[PDB]
Design a protein around this ligand. Structure first.
Ligand SMILES: CC(=O)N[C@@H]1[C@@H](O)[C@H](O[C@@H]2O[C@H](CO)[C@H](O)[C@H](O)[C@H]2O[C@@H]2O[C@@H](C)[C@@H](O)[C@@H](O)[C@@H]2O)[C@@H](CO)O[C@H]1O
Ligand SMILES: CC(=O)N[C@@H]1[C@@H](O)[C@H](O[C@@H]2O[C@H](CO)[C@H](O)[C@H](O)[C@H]2O[C@@H]2O[C@@H](C)[C@@H](O)[C@@H](O)[C@@H]2O)[C@@H](CO)O[C@H]1O
Ligand SMILES: CC(=O)N[C@@H]1[C@@H](O)[C@H](O[C@@H]2O[C@H](CO)[C@H](O)[C@H](O)[C@H]2O[C@@H]2O[C@@H](C)[C@@H](O)[C@@H](O)[C@@H]2O)[C@@H](CO)O[C@H]1O
Ligand SMILES: CC(=O)N[C@@H]1[C@@H](O)[C@H](O[C@@H]2O[C@H](CO)[C@H](O)[C@H](O)[C@H]2O[C@@H]2O[C@@H](C)[C@@H](O)[C@@H](O)[C@@H]2O)[C@@H](CO)O[C@H]1O
Lengths: 150, 150, 150, 150
């Protein structure tokens, strides 16, 4: 299923993002002078199941979670540098049941153990000065699709 | 290369759409009550190399061409019905050198002999009440990419 | 539909190879010092709808057609000039209704106007010293599948 | 990278099968009355990093590991219960660093925690009466490739 997720907005998923689900987020642009950009996978109750804070100025990408009116837990970080590929950078998130796998353009995957046992009903996108385009293209799969030879 | 083509607007291609090029246009929605929707492949000089007029009310899809200040030539038509697949209908255009191949979700391809020997520098999207989303996602390939088993 | 086509053998297609059909042939190797290698798309009646003779020595690729017990028609040749990318070279054939499109790893697409109005029911592979592996992996589609962004 | 893995044989990988690596195994047939079929991911030192024993009779799939001249470790089994889609069944194995992900045509992904900290250098295929074709088509990726919208 294809969605167009606009900045400082979100998209309500047709079906819940759950185990086996794959979300391929792709930007039509890369604004090198952009600021902190965030993507949140939210449950129906608006709990932040997966928070991805891309911070170029801090050279880090922070992952976390928290209930709608709860507090962030410990942060999980990785260097920002050498992760995205202009002019069409991408973010791929896969739900492996007990944890999410996040993959950017380069480098190894990031694995984030789930902290809230719920499926995502929406994906939000927030940024004052986004690093990516608005909207960003999002393809959500119920399961990993057949793969091309390359 | 990924582009976000908004309705009643266009996208300037990074490189020209020419022989071997493949443009995959995908909508995030299908507005059954939408009207006539158009996609034009334009040259640098703004000549309409390939005009695709999707007319639900007339139950037809019209293909044509014309110079920037020229006249349409003869029309090439196909029934509108059973061509698109909601909620993510698509249009795939392939430049075969001497003609374009246009493929929708269902049915056989449409072949349109080129009438203007030029490459496209832009793709335009026009509609009063579009049948598709705004923007529509557009992936342009320099050549047919590797194919998945299905 | 996946088939394993062995050298000096053939594979019977579960479905007619006809307009919109795509055959993605892939080899697990490239035998540098290989000799003339042939791929034929045959009708159920064993007419050779599309003959592809890749000749390293003569440095040409000959395309032709012929009825079961008939003689070869006029040849349509092009220079061989390094069309394959080792170690996994590919040959993709697409049925466009009035003609076939043949794409290798390099060079431009080759177009061959159909000479016999029949669909292919089998693909044959012949060679004394094949340029490719035995068997070759063959994925046949009834229509062009959705494409990855790259 | 494409390989043709023959039954009761193996294929030496041009590159280490390691974190981020994906092995897409595809069969050109499904032998209904086939017997126990095995696929092993081996280290260059011939340690069995991941053993996959598909047993129709016992109706289970056993996953295990073992050093070259060592004994099998504790078994991790699941019911076989119709995991393959004829006539072209598939097995996809992904290296996630601390564990392997194995996906069949049906059922959920199977996760197997790594028991040996080595990368795979070869994939073996064993069976007296294989459930699948010989050889099986194997596409190995260094990283998950861009995905088609479907
Ligand atoms: C190393 C460390 O622990 N630094 C902490 C920052 O990462 C925290 O920032 C907040 O982090 C959460 C995720 O854990 C989320 O990304 C918040 O949006 C983020 O807060 C924003 O960004 C900060 C840099 C501040 O400008 C803040 O005002 C913003 O609202 C902060 C706050 O929890 O604590 C640091 O110790
Ligand atoms: C069967 C036939 O020939 N009908 C003709 C219409 O198809 C023409 O419409 C115009 O067609 C061109 C492509 O050839 C292009 O799609 C134009 O946008 C389209 O004109 C618009 O749509 C028409 C239905 C009218 O409402 C017109 O005012 C719009 O501007 C017309 C006009 O060339 O002629 C018919 O004969
Ligand atoms: C310059 C020229 O026209 N050369 C002709 C060859 O191309 C012909 O070869 C045959 O070509 C058909 C397709 O047209 C098919 O590829 C046959 O396998 C091929 O014949 C074989 O290869 C030849 C090189 C000879 O060794 C022949 O004995 C084999 O049977 C030939 C024959 O039609 O004529 C040439 O003039
Ligand atoms: C209930 C139980 O634990 N069953 C055990 C079998 O699963 C074992 O079979 C061997 O299992 C390993 C992986 O753990 C591998 O699949 C071996 O090929 C397999 O041994 C073969 O198949 C068996 C069914 C026997 O026919 C045996 O002779 C073969 O060599 C066996 C042996 O470890 O123990 C069972 O208890």
């Amino acid at each position: 299923m294809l969605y167009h997720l606009f900045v400082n907005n979100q998209v309500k998923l047709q079906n819940d993002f759950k185990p086996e689900s794959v979300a391929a987020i792709r930007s039509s642009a890369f604004n090198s002078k952009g600021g902190t950009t965030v993507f949140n996978f939210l449950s129906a109750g608006e709990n932040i199941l997966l928070h991805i804070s891309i911070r170029p100025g801090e050279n880090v990408i922070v992952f976390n979670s928290r209930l709608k009116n709860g507090a962030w837990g410990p942060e999980e970080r990785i260097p920002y540098a050498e992760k995205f590929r202009p002019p069409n950078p991408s973010i791929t998130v896969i739900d492996h049941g007990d944890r999410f796998q996040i993959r950017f353009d380069y480098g190894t995957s990031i694995y984030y153990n789930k902290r809230i046992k719920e499926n995502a009903a929406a994906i939000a996108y927030n940024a004052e000065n986004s690093l990516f385009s608005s909207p960003v293209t999002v393809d959500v799969h119920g399961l990993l699709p057949p793969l091309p030879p390359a």
